Every structure is written in C-alpha cells, then in structure tokens.
Structure 1
C-alpha cells in the first residue's frame, strides 16, 4: 500500500454502490456543498497523488464529522493519516480545545495536506507522530491513565494489522467510546470466501477483513455497526 506497489491493487475502479451515478449524486448533492474549502483543496491535490485510491471520500468524511459531533468527542486518535483528509475532518469537527494523536509511518504524505490543515486554523489540535502505529499504541497502553482515555479512534492504516490494532484500542478508548475501522468491505470483495485475480498483498488485506468482520461481530467487548458508506466503515462502541 502507501505504507510498503500501486500496481498490486486491482480493484481501485470498483465501488460498493450500485452505480457511479448514485455515488456522484450523493457527493454533488450532499457532500461537496458541506465540505470545508480546505478539505476540498486537500482532496483535489490528493486526487492527483499516486496513492489517491487510499483517500477517504467526502461523503464518508461528513459522516465521520457527524459522529464526532453527536458523541461530543474531545480527545481522539487517527491511525493512518495519508495526506490528512480524515484527520482534517476530525480537527474541524472537534471543539477548539480538542486534541488529536495522529500516527502514520510516512510524514511526507502528511506534509502534502499540512498547508490546508494550517490554513483551516486547526493544526494546534494535532500531535503528529511519525511511526508504525503498533509500538506507539503499546507505549500508550503502558503510560495511559483512565481519565486520559480517547473518545474516538479512526483506524485506516496497514490493512493486515487491524486485528492487532483492535486489541490495543479496546483498552485505549473509553467505555462508551468509538473505534471506527475503515475499508471493511474492501471494494465488495469480502462478500466471497474466494475472489479471483488479486495480487498477494491485496488478497492478504481481503482475508484480513473477512476475519476481522467475523471477529468483531463475535467480540463481547464492543457493540458494532458495519455501515455501507465509502468502502465500508465498522463502528465499534466499547462496552467494558
């Protein structure tokens, strides 16, 4: 992936909705008119970037923003930033004193979106950490206190590692807090045990998501809602 080729991914032209016309209707009617001008700018630059397949889309973004506001989130973690579309979405949603821990192995991607984040006036909310996510989460587990738990986590980093992220995040997000997993329908390819013609890295991701979806549905630590928005977003709410 953007982490560690573009040619290894064979489904980038697929969408989970029944037609591109329906997706374009949602974007033009309901998403783009509500998208911050700096999110638009960041999106348009990123659409030209070689890894644009990884970009969180605008209708999904407004849904993330809505969830953040409805749950009155204040402290969040963003895992897998890329050029920062979902991160800027989060920073604009949070109150003025909101705080985001943002983690990505590749800070050069973040620097593409950083001028839009800065012009949006919300960079002060963001503590960006350039690292693989798991060691950072493991260190947070050692140092965290109960009153500093996160309200919300958005997970959108190495697809094969979501299950390992989950085991840390169910302890780092507060009870009643939210953990969101991005891309859980993987272009619709999760719908079959076997699926033709994927390169090995993409098949690893597809199988990881089939296993994750089954696991999350059985996991008593959370309630879940798998939402057919974007490429599938699974919302988890921590029960205990």
Structure 2
C-alpha cells in the first residue's frame, strides 16, 4: 500500500512457486524454521523474508563448500541466519549484524529451541562500521568462508569492497535481491517508491560492476529475488 514491488515474483506464475515450495522446500524445512517463518509472515515487513526454497539453497551451498565461519549482514527475524546455523557443523561460528535487534528477538526463541544459538555472535549496529573494524583486527587465518548480504540495498557496493578482503580466497559472497522483483531489467521503471527506485538503480550498477570485477567469479541465480554468488579469486 506504500511500496509497489511487494506483490511481484520473478517466476512466470504463483502456481510454479507454490509447487516448488510445497513439493521440495516445506518437506525439507526444519520445524524451527517453519515456526520462525509463520510468525514472520504476520509481521508488517514480511515481504523482506528470505523464502523457503532459497533458504534450502543457502543451506546446500554451505554444506557443499564445508563452511565453518560465516558472516550474515541483515538478519531481520533470522530465517537465513537460523538456516545457516542449522547447516554449519556443531563448532561453526556466525557473525550476525543488523541495526534492529527487535526483529531478531522475534526469531531468537526458535533459534534457541533449535539449539544453535551458541553458534551466533549478534551485533546490533550498522553493517559498515563493523566491517571496517573487522578489517583492522582480521588475521589471515581468521577470514570468513561465506558471507550473506541482505541489508540496506543501496549499500551493497560498499559492503562488497570490505567483503572481498574479509572472505578467504575461494570463499563465497552472496548478494540477495539482485533481480529486485524483475525491475532491474529496464533502464526506466514506473511508479516505484523513492527507496525502491534507489535500490533498483543500485542493483543495476552492482550487477554491471560485479560482472566486470576481476577479484571474483560470479553466478546470478534466478532463485528467490535473485541471488548473486561471488567467489573470491585473489
């Protein structure tokens, strides 16, 4: 009623997305992930929730690459965070960052019931100052295997400049929402809320930049709202 893109999906039909969720995603969704999702769906910002089919995709990536130490930028109620914590080994460690811990406390009971809260170091701050402080203290043997970026959309390019130094060589950086409900496909797009237009132009610039960035290999994956996987080359 205030933002324009919230009822749009990138697949050709709602029926196909429902088929995917019902056939493949929900039967593989942890019970605490199911709980966190269903309370979040009643929250006013439920449009920002990472969907269940994308969540299982993040879980698969974490396990295939044997991730141990991860960083999560943009937590909200914690669906992707809890997804990550359940995918990591028992000794896995996550640095979670979000300006608003009130959202996080919506999901924390489910994280606790899942028995994975011990893996999480939550920092209530803006992401950039923490990443900049991490650049001064980071030791080469302390680099992250994996980074999920899902915070302020207009700041992804700034996040990238830090994360290509905070993630190990061969580690992964994942940028959520890089297709922005399909609106990135046109130079001009009508009738968006000013912040949705800022994010749209930001993603158009980020997609072009990442495609030309020699520090990484990339794969833009038309899952959820678009996820761009980056792999650090040096």
TM-score by length of 1: 0.97
Matched with 2:180 is 186
CA contact (8 A) 1:103 1:130 kept: yes
* Match of residue 198 from structure 1: 192
2:146 is matched with 152
Cα offset for 1:8?
Answer: 4.2
SS of residue paired to 1:48:
coil
Structure 1 residue 9, shift from structure 2 partner: 1.9
Q: Structure 1, residues 137-191: CA drift from partner, whole Å, max 9, x if none? A: 0000000000000000000000000000000000000000000000000000000
3-state SS of paired residue (2:20) = helix
1-side partners of 2:155 and 2:161: how far apart?
10
Partner of 2:209: 215
RMSD, matched Cα:
0.5
Q: Which residues of structure 1 form unaligned runs of 5+?
A: 1-6
Q: Tell me the secondary structure at the aligned position of residue 6 of structure 2.
A: coil
Cα deviation 1:64-83 (Å, max 9, x = unaligned)? 00000000000000000000
User: 1:84 Cα deviation (Å)?
Assistant: 0.1
Cα separation, 2, equivalents of 1:199 and 1:32 = 32
Match of 2:91 in 1: 97
Q: Which residue number in structure 2 is paired with residue 68 of structure 1?
A: 62
SS at match of 1:12: helix
Q: How far apart are the structure 2 equivalents of 1:20 and 1:62?
A: 19
Deviation above 4 Å: which 4+ runs of structure 1? none
- Shift of residue 200, structure 1, vs aligned partner: 1.0
Deviations, residues 60-110 of structure 1 (Å, cap 9, x unaligned): 000000000000000000000000000000000000000000000000000
Distance 2:232 2:223 in 1: 21
Structure 2, unmatched stretches of 5+, are: none
**8 Å contact kept, 1:8–1:201:** no
Contact 1:80–1:156 (Cα < 8 Å) also in 2: yes
CA distance in 2, matches of 1:93, 1:231: 22
* Superimposed CA distance per residue, residues 179-208 of structure 1 (whole angstroms, 9 cap, x where no aligned partner): 000000000000000000012111000000
SS of 2:169 mapped into structure 1? strand
Q: Tell me the number of residue pairs that the alignment of Structure 1 and Structure 2 aligns.
A: 234
Question: 2: CA distance between counterparts of 1:204 and 1:91?
Answer: 32
